[PDB]
Amino acid sequence: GPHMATGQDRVVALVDMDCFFVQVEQRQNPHLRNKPCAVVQYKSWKGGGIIAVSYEARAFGVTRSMWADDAKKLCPDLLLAQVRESRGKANLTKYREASVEVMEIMSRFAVIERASIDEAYVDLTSAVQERLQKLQGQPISADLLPSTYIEGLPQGPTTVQKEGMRKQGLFQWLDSLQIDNLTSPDLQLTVGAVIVEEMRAAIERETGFQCSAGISHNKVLAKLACGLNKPNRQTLVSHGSVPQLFSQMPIRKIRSLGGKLGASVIEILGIEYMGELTQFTESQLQSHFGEKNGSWLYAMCRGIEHDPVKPRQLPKTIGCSKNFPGKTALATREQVQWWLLQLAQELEERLTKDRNDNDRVATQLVVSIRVQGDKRLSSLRRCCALTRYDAHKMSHDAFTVIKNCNTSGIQTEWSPPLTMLFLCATKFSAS
DNA sequence: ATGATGACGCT
DNA sequence: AGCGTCAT
Numbered sequence A: 001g002p003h004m005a006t007g008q009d010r011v012v013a014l015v016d017m018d019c020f021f022v023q024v025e026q027r028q029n030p031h032l033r034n035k036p037c038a039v040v041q042y043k044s045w046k047g048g049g050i051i052a053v054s055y056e057a058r059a060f061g062v063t064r065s066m067w068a069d070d071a072k073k074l075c076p077d078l079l080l081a082q083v084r085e086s087r088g089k090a091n092l093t094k095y096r097e098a099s100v101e102v103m104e105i106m107s108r109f110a111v112i113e114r115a116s117i118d119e120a121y122v123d124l125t126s127a128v129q130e131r132l133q134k135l136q137g138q139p140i141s142a143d144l145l146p147s148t149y150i151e152g153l154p155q156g157p158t159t160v161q162k163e164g165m166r167k168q169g170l171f172q173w174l175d176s177l178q179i180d181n182l183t184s185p186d187l188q189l190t191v192g193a194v195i196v197e198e199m200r201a202a203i204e205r206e207t208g209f210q211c212s213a214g215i216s217h218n219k220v221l222a223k224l225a226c227g228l229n230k231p232n233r234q235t236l237v238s239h240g241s242v243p244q245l246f247s248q249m250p251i252r253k254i255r256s257l258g259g260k261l262g263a264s265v266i267e268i269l270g271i272e273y274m275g276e277l278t279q280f281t282e283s284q285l286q287s288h289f290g291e292k293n294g295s296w297l298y299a300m301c302r303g304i305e306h307d308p309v310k311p312r313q314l315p316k317t318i319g320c321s322k323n324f325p326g327k328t329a330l331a332t333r334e335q336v337q338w339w340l341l342q343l344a345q346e347l348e349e350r351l352t353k354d355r356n357d358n359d360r361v362a363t364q365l366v367v368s369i370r371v372q373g374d375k376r377l378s379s380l381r382r383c384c385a386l387t388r389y390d391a392h393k394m395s396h397d398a399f400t401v402i403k404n405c406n407t408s409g410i411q412t413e414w415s416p417p418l419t420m421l422f423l424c425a426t427k428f429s430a431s
Numbered sequence B: 001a002t003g004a005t006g007a008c009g010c011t
Numbered sequence C: 001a002g003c004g005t006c007a008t
């Protein structure tokens, strides 16, 4: 009772951009706005691979990883924007620059953890404390929360349209809120949501991009919350909402459980939903999934997680990769060297920009290859020192550390053919 | 023949 | 170090 911690100590948000690469392209080209639209890479293979899809196009069943030629079968009027190509490969600079626009705005409000090119976690615990004091003790108006859903509401005795349902739940929540108690976790979450409304308003005003967000007590619930009412809405998931929410929540939807661990939780325990984990002891879970995973699952199915919002706005690595599928797998030494040089040249440009922008230098170069006949992301990784931002030196060094994989007795030929090259700059130091 | 990335755990 | 998982 009095000593059972409830994981309600923090206010955490996750802000995720809506159909992000599409919005970047729609801002640039007004002809694409409010249309079924997708972003594709490499136009020559079946129209290009789709990597982002507007919500209008999603309505036709267009999805990521679809070939554009196939997407056009579902959506004849689908509009497309192509990823830039430079040095023979996709170049994602435009989307990285747009990401920086958004991350810099979020950073005005609180220290963020950059979690992907289009999302960040926010620890709003301190900002909420400050706002509660500035608030005399006055009630929180629904007008301060114009795009907020309260997960689980409305409920109970006694509209058929979306916005009507959103307001009814919000009214139930606010009507029941105690504002007298500055330490109520529900009150803290509500103030957190007010601040996220302000943050999302700033992002849209200053960039033109819309986003969604989740507000909860930890990263996993905030991430889950964010997706519940996409696009262009934010969702508050209270501690109290967790038992019903998890009662029918497939295990694979919780971050980190979407892969083999999640599958084994399902198979080994014979369950389907996150809430069903509560039936097991902490020791039982640890026996099946290990000390760390066991403890994490035991707490997480109760809505509790302690993973901190890390103070990190910048990527820890900078890398360049290219696949060479099927018949195009690299089979000559000079092929391998030309492409390593292409990669190294992009990497040099990004590293030099990074060193000017962020006062740091990378010190290790990691070279990864995939071999024809494998299936793994990487077949092989080798590292060496990164001592100069020079593409010719980097590409020469990368060849040095991988050139012995070449089983071919003939020196001009490469065997077995390479289906992927990857260069990654790592181990940054202040500069 | 998704592809281009990026974080972090394990031994 | 180098490999494996999970992720957008």
Ligand SMILES: Nc1ccn([C@H]2C[C@H](O)[C@@H](COP(=O)(O)NP(=O)(O)OP(=O)(O)O)O2)c(=O)n1
Pocket: A016, A017, A018, A019, A020, A021, A022, A051, A052, A053, A064, A117, A118, A230, A231, C008
């Ligand atoms: N497998 C993936 C997933 C995302 N991305 C890129 C394109 C996406 O626009 C961007 C952000 O990914 P995302 O947040 O998962 N989805 P996106 O923002 O496009 O749509 P939402 O569902 O978030 O509204 O990363 C990618 O290149 N490969």
Ligand SMILES: [Mg+2]
Pocket: A016, A017, A018, A019, A020, A118
């Ligand atoms: Mg997104």
Ligand SMILES: [Mg+2]
Pocket: A016, A017, A116, A118, A119, C008
């Ligand atoms: Mg995202």
